[PDB]
Amino acid sequence: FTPVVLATPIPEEVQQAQTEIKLFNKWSFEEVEVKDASLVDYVQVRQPIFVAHTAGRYANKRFRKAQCPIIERLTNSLMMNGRNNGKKLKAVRIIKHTLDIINVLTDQNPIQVVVDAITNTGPREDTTRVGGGGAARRQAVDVSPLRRVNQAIALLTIGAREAAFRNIKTIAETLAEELINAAKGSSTSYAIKKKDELERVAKSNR
Amino acid sequence: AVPSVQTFGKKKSATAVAHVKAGKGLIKVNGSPITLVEPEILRFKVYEPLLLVGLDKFSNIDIRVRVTGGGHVSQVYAIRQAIAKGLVAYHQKYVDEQSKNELKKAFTSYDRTLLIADSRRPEPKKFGGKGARSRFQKSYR
Amino acid sequence: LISKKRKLVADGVFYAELNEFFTRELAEEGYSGVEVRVTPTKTEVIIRATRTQDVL
Amino acid sequence: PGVSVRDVAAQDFINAYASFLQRQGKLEVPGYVDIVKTSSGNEMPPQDAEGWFYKRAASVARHIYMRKQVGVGKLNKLYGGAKSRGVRPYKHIDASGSINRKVLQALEKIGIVEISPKGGRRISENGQRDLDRIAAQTLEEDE
Amino acid sequence: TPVTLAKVIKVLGRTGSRGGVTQVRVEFLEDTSRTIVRNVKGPVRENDILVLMESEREARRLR
Amino acid sequence: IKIRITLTSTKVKQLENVSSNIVKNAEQHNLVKKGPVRLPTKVLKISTRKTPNGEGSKTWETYEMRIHKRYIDLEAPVQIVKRITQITIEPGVDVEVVVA
Amino acid sequence: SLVVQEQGSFQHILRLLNTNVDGNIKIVYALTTIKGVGRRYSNLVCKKADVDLHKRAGELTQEELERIVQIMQNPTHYKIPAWFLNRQNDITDGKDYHTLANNVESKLRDDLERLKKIRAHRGIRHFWGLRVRGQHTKTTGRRRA
Amino acid sequence: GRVRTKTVKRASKALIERYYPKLTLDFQTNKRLCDEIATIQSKRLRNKIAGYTTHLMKRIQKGPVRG
Amino acid sequence: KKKWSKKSMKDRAQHAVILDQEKYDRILKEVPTYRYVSVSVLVDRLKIGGSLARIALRHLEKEGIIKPISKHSKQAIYTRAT
């Protein structure tokens, strides 16, 4: 690392976070290894990105959706429920505010906390109407690893959406305690409570 | 005979045309330093060309960008394509080639868009629906 | 004194009116089409039919 | 070294320049200040309600100094926004032109903007430096 | 709460009224050379590790 | 003198002939000319319901017609401008000549 | 900036113009409980009397209350543009009025009954109770009572 | 769909029957023969003609093709 | 109005409107042990209101007790300082 002087003043803080290593905005995407197997190669890690604003051409096919970062995935589920459909300017901004909260509470790496919560939240059993005809009912099957992150991220973002609805805790903070609770587990998380309900319901259908 | 070159980048309907010449290395956004894009989030998304390969490669060359058309996020993507190509174009036929190719793997490895732009354009609307693909609705009574 | 957009639209109006004239009045003369050629200070109309001596 | 209005961000520049007129405090007062709605699409006037004739001049002059010539009709389309006309969808509605017309008239006698050819209002000899000199310490305010 | 880890070796096909459930044969990570068939809801490639809350239940063969 | 030529036909293949024929005349006459500049095809759109009635599926098809414009600048004395304005006449092709 | 610690002058809901105006809400929006004053009318009077709009209504010096009312009772006398008001050259004298807590429903009834003795079309429709604004009535207004 | 039609099957088959001691197994050279050795009304057909030509010319390299 | 819906009421919260000495001394001795204070944090915490919370963070940072890390509108992120 060395400072660079130039005709137009470029401040020093921006330069540092790219020379020693290509970081996030202010945080790090390395040492975010996934502790629980069967999810690695589906939760995208080891290629950091600066900002979650990126339009990747990922839409012609069936299985290349394990290559875009989990961070931008979580951002893209904030844009839902009508009035805020699209508008990725605020989806990025809200997640910018969220990572400030997991930085201060649960002092673990905010990227690590998010990734840990995703693995801990994805149900591994679900129901399906299967039978030999009209005599068909709930049937228990297993959830694929790609669907797990799909199922997991859905509950995390909608918990903040519904909880910040008609409640003063903003979306930027209401998503924090969901991740805080989803990672370690307290059964007061919106997503974790849905997870155990879904698994137990599927278990009863054996 | 001032050394100079000009290339362009784009987005959905935006078209940026950066001017790449040898100089002190000042960067402008249509009149102003590149620190004043002001989405305040996409700033590192357009800092990507400057910082991914380092500012020493941009130290001896200045860039002036003119951006037209598109949306607000589209104009930011316009700037990054032209700046990425401009360094590649300058290092191809003023600087030695072995700098140019190693720059290509510097860009296309991290984000594909910087040198090869998207092949996606808006689709015309069709009668029978509000947009290009959806229908209005249907009612049978 | 007319916009070029309006001129070529009204130019096609001239042909459509002329075509419906030359098919209603020259119906039994084997009329088979018409086309209009524009010249400075002179306008031409070609009536393409079979019984030209009967048309004249 | 060199200081340009384009070398400073937009928000801090207009906020700093607006205060300078408030400190100097001699240009004009329309006579109906703070009674006017400032548009036909804004259903409430300026919330601070302290200025809008010393702070509007901070943002209109920045455009006029930037571009070649801007007239009062251009501001109406520029500073306007969608008007929520009740149960109806949104529609672009221009702004109140009287304040736009009269804020420029004050700029005439203070030597900032004067009459210009091909119509419109253009910055004057004193206009260019005055903005740059004011915008100067907005860069040295960091020390 | 013993969770079993098994790895897909082949994708048999789609199953269900609307075919929403894929058919898979897996090999156990621990105690290998044992193969079982499981009904999986979502999409499954090869070389993808599964987790189960139950081990001795083979999916009914569609034949 | 600064005479200017303009071509506004609707048929490019017919219209490119006249523009080609006029540029070659001055070039073989050794007179400086401003090359043929082709304006964007201004589009006149008319969209209507196909049906004469009001019933059936609401099919909305468009009829389009395109206008192709060309203009060329010349500097020629009076003697040769007269013989070039009365030539290069094609059906459906409109030309207007303005001096200065 | 600095925050006032506390004072004994704070009071709960107070009384003026036959309306118990609530406290603990800003004087620009606390005075919208009285009819005849809207979101704008309170905004205009509070600044014309040199009253701090940011200051709430719960903490508001008593002598500042009656300074407000005479401005509200006679706006034209205290340099108002005079097109704010809702009754100008009302029907009777050409003087500019503005209906308030008691006269908003009093003058509405007078405007209601002005056109009934005249046997106008609008007056009859009000007596009939239907929409007098010339709207379509085939489909709108079914649950009107 | 990428299954070629009769107008591509027959025009290509007509070429090897008559241009065997001729245009080789490389597409970009074949298409620069077809544009002058044959009058083809459309470029897209000519591109598909020299396409199925190369595919058949690549077959004749290893053994003969029946038909 | 054809429902089978109950339309239950709310708790009718009683958040304070303006500060007072009995609570002003309470905030300055309770903002510690809060590793995160914000406008909505200081709502389920000490009963000051939405505007009171905003003016409090504006005041407790003007003199300064804890280091603030964000100034973005509509979301304030603060943390205690060593």
Next chain:
RNA sequence: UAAUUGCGAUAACGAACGAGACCUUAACCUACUAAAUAGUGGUGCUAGCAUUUGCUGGUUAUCCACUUCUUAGAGGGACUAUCGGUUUCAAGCCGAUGGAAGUUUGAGGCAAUAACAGGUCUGUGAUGCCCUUAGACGUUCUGGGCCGCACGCGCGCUACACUGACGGAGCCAGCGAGUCUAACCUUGGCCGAGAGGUCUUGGUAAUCUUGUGAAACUCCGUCGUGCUGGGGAUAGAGCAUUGUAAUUAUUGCUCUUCAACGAGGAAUUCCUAGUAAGCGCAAGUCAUCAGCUUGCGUUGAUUACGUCCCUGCCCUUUGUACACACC
């Protein structure tokens, strides 16, 4: 295969139509062909920061040079190309590579035979027959009505709040339109709270409105979970504009008034990348009026690549008491 799209036994020889090919449109060309009706760099005159070589600008009779970006014509450019697996191993996809472009590259136009007693005699001076034809069912004029209102539905618009509302700021599109023997689009100055008015100017249009400075939007603010600054239905009063004429308010502006609605049950619709969904602009209607439509651009998700469950569609076998054919 999307396709009797391709292809090899074998009682058939070729063909025609359809699909496709074709036309339009969409993106690549730093290579061909030109441009103050478009631009860019430099030199003249000139403004500002600094004064030190630089940075941001303006200038039409100050020229000079060029065409990356914008327009274009003819063209080139993709044909699934290169490689490993699959099936009498007979041709694509997969896996990857290349590229601007590899779901016929995307989307449209065109779109067969045969039928419906489908709609249309209110577009026609396109019609047969029937009616009528002088207080005419012909024409025109005046005032009404098509809007009328206990109620039941359809296509929709605005919403039920902090992913918020509102206030000052930053601020970006493409599709198009536009007056002559007429009165169209109108920048600019001035007046006005606003609506709007007033005096000139520009434009038959890449030169002017137009960079259509759109809106959703981003920064600072105020609010604070209260049917509250959500929501603005209902009403009352005044000022304008269109129109000979607006009363059952044409429409715009100003203040006041402030209802349901607290996310909506059975049911039910559409949708697979720049696609849904959200956002606004232009045009068609227009003397005035969008909550419609036809287009355009803006931000941009989730879930599959599936199956025959439903509802339909296509081909073969089989059954038929059906033939205006399962109503």
